[PDB]
Every structure is written in structure tokens, then in C-alpha cells.
Amino acid sequence: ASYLSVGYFNGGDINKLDVTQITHLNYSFGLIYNDEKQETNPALKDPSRLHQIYLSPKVMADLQLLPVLRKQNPELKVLLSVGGWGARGFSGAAATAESRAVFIRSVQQVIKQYHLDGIDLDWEYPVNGAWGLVESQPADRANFTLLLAELHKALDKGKLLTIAVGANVKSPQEWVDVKGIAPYLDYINLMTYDMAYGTQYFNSNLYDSKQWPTVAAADRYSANFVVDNYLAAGLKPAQLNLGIGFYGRVPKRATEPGIDWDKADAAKNPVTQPYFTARETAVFKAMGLDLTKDSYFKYNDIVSKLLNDPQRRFTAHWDSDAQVPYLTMKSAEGKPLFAISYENPRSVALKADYIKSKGLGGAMFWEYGADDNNRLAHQLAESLGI
Numbered sequence: 507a508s509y510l511s512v513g514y515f516n517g518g519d520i521n522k523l524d525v526t527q528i529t530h531l532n533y534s535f536g537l538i539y540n541d542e543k544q545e546t547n548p549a550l551k552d553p554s555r556l557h558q559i560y561l562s563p564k565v566m567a568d569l570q571l572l573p574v575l576r577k578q579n580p581e582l583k584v585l586l587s588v589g590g591w592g593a594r595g596f597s598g599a600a601a602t603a604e605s606r607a608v609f610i611r612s613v614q615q616v617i618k619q620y621h622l623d624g625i626d627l628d629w630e631y632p633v634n635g636a637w638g639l640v641e642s643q644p645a646d647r648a649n650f651t652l653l654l655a656e657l658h659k660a661l662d663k664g665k666l667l668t669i670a671v672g673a674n675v676k677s678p679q680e681w682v683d684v685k686g687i688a689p690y691l692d693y694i695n696l697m698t699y700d701m702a703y704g705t706q707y708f709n710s711n712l713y714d715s716k717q718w719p720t721v722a723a724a725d726r727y728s729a730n731f732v733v734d735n736y737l738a739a740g741l742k743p744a745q746l747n748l749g750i751g752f753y754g755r756v757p758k759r760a761t762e763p764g765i766d767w768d769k770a771d772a773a774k775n776p777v778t779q780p781y782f783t784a785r786e787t788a789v790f791k792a793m794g795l796d797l798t799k800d801s802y803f804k805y806n807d808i809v810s811k812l813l814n815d816p817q818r819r820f821t822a823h824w825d826s827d828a829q830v831p832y833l834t835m836k837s838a839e840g841k842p843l844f845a846i847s848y849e850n851p852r853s854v855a856l857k858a859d860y861i862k863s864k865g866l867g868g869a870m871f872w873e874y875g876a877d878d879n880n881r882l883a884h885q886l887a888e889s890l891g892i
């Protein structure tokens with residue numbers, strides 16, 4: 507058996523990447539010129555370029571460096587990934603025969619100009635939108651299928667067409683017609699992370715934790731559960747890459763009450779209460795993580811600031827059921843508080859073992875700039891036999 511290792515790089519530096527350890531490199535992000543009224547990026551509002559791909563100056567400069575990287579690994583495939591969390595424009599781009607043709611024409615132009623091997627679409631998310639951050643409509647689901655079918659017909663034979671899809675149970679069931687789009691995609695990147703929300707402690711647990719259990723049923727996610735949901739929806743295992751996050755998250759449960767929305771009196775009667783005080787929030791703020799804005803910490807920052815804290819305020823632990831590491835910090839009363847879960851070489855190796863045991867097509871990871879001296883990608887490549 508052979509396996510993929512599909513590495514994303516958030517470039518929009520790139521020379522520190524060891525591309526000998528991956529089969530595919532996705533450069534992130536291309537954006538989409540769009541007319542969504544809430545768009546705040548002034549560069550995307552050019553009406554003469556509506557529905558085309560926007561490349562910032564840094565993105566253009568980095569894409570021109572790709573022939574250098576190709577020398578280091580002549581087998582490497584390089585794609586541009588368009589979209590990302592918060593990226594507007596897909597709903598409109600996919601909506602009509604006119605808009606789709608503009609977008610496809612732009613994809614073809616970018617692949618030719620920068621000698622890319624293909625394109626990755628990272629739409630977060632069709633139908634659902636994303637809590638007011640991108641426009642959506644129920645027609646997104648059928649329109650996404652049309653866009654991918656028309657992209658497949660337009661792309662030169664052999665160029666790659668891939669997508670990234672969300673962990674949410676509703677993605678294969680309601681948002682994306684996975685059986686309908688499977689004929690058009692070389693592989694599908696499952697974003698099997700970002701689970702440390704609501705009442706769940708862990709961000710990318712492989713299985714459910716018993717020691718640190720998720721309280722509300724609708725929050726009970728694991729990478730295994732996500733894979734099973736896409737398989738049950740009809741995707742074949744060889745077409746799937748299990749996504750691995752080179753980062754961790756402080757769970758929302760540490761700082762926000764957790765709601766079980768299956769309760770009739772849900773909003774006023776939380777089932778979990780926050781356990782961070784201002785003391786713990788200030789510790790993270792002083793290290794660059796403002797928990798009022800976001801909750802993630804890159805793996806290299808976990809290593810430098812948390813695992814190697816001079817005053818050893820963070821203690822590393824292993825959850826044998828979730829198969830991922832986590833850190834605790836001591837409260838003012840000296841009690842352990844669950845601070846952050848993440849991925850380390852041991853847990854990355856167990857996810858590669860899982861890939862092999864299930865016959866998945868490979869691994870994907872987000873993102874290479876957050877690795878610690880390429881150690882997580884190296885472990886992934888070793889465990890997968892890359």
C-alpha cells in the first residue's frame with residue numbers, strides 16, 4: 507500500500523519547509539473577488555474581477571518560488587487552495603452558468619501562469635455558511651456539484667481537483683453531495699479537527715475521551731466519528747485524507763458556559779461552566795493568545811511557550827482513550843485545569859496507524875508553518891512509509 511501526505515502551507519518562510527516529506531503541497535490562500543455586502547477586504551470588491559481568484563502580492567511572490575521547491579522533491583505535486591475559514595465568494599461564484607465560467611476561467615489562468623498541478627477548493631461552508639462570516643443558501647449544495655463537474659470537464663486531463671470538507675455531521679448529510687461530487691475529485695481532505703467547542707475538551711481526539719468527557723451529545727466529536735460519517739455517506743476510503751492539525755486549542759468550555767441545545771430550557775441552564783478565571787486568561791494573553799478572539803496555538807508555539815515554559819506552569823499528559831496529548835495548568839488553589847489539547851509525534855503516529863488500518867488514501871495536515879523543526883510532518887512520513 508501507498509499513502510498520501512498532503513501538506514498545507516499558510517503563506518498568504520516557505521523555504522524552511524522540508525518538502526521531501528510530503529506528496530502534495532497546498533499553498534493557502536487564494537481568495538475570491540466577491541460582492542457580498544459584509545466583505546471587509548477592499549481588494550476583493552473590484553467589480554471588474556467579480557468571481558475571479560484574488561492573489562495578494564505575498565501569494566504571487568510565494569507561488570513564483572515553487573520551482574525552487576520542486577527541485578528538492580521532483581515528485582511533489584503543488585496546488586493552490588482557494589478559500590478558507592471566513593473566505594467569501596463561493597456561493598456567488600457557484601450560483602450561475604455565468605459566474606461558474608468566470609471562476610473556472612480564473613482557475614485555469616492561475617494554474618497555467620504559476621505552473622501548478624491543480625486546485626483545491628476550501629469552501630467553509632456551502633449551505634451552512636459560517637455563523638455570519640460567509641453568505642450561503644440551500645442551492646449551494648447542488649451548485650457546488652455543478653461547479654466541480656464543470657471544473658472537471660474544463661481542467662486539462664491530469665490536473666488535480668481536490669476539496670476540503672468540515673467535521674460537522676451535517677456536512678456529508680446536508681451541505682455537500684458527497685456521492686455526487688466524488689467522480690470529479692482526485693481526493694478529499696477531511697478537516698478532522700477543531701472539535702474543542704461547546705462542551706468538548708479535545709480539539710482533534712481520535713476517539714472519545716472517558717477521563718474528560720463531552721457532556722452535550724451534539725458536541726461529541728472525534729476524528730474516527732467524522733471518518734465514519736463520510737464513509738456512511740458513500741465515500742470510498744481510498745479517496746479520503748485524514749486531516750491532522752499542527753496546533754492545539756484552549757477548549758471553549760474553559761471560558762464560556764456550555765449549552766446542551768437538546769434541552770428545552772437549554773440557553774438559561776448550561777451543562778458546563780467555565781473554569782478559567784482572569785488569572786488563567788491573562789497567562790495566555792501574555793503569551794499572544796487572546797481567548798476573547800480565538801483559541802488556537804500553533805504547535806511550534808506550544809513547544810516553545812508551553813512545554814518549555816521556564817517556570818513549568820504547564821504539565822503534559824496523555825489521554826489513552828482520545829489518543830492525543832493535553833496540558834494542565836494549576837489554578838490559584840493549586841488544582842489542575844485542562845488548558846489545551848494538541849498533536850505531538852505520538853498522536854500523529856497513531857493517526858497514521860489509523861489511516862493504514864482503515865485503508866484511507868493518506869493524511870492531510872494544517873499547516874506546515876506551525877510545525878516544530880518539521881517534526882510532526884517527519885513522524886507522519888515515517889509512519890506512512892513516505
Ligand SMILES: CC(=O)N[C@H]1[C@H](O[C@H]2[C@@H](O)[C@@H](NC(C)=O)[C@H](O[C@H]3[C@H](O)[C@H]4N=C(N(C)C)O[C@H]4[C@@H]3CO)O[C@@H]2CO)O[C@H](CO)[C@@H](O)[C@H]1O
Nearest residue numbers: 514587589590591592593628670695697700753802871872
Ligand atoms: C476570517 C479570519 O478569521 N481571518 C483571520 C485568520 O484566520 C485564519 C486562522 O483562523 C486559521 N486557523 C488556524 C488554526 O490556523 C484558519 O485555518 C483554517 C483554514 O482556513 C481551514 N482550511 C483548512 N484546510 C483546507 C485544510 O484547514 C482549516 C484551518 C484550521 O481550522 O485560517 C484562517 C483564515 O482562513 O487568521 C489571521 C491570523 O490570526 C487573522 O489576521 C485573520 O486574517
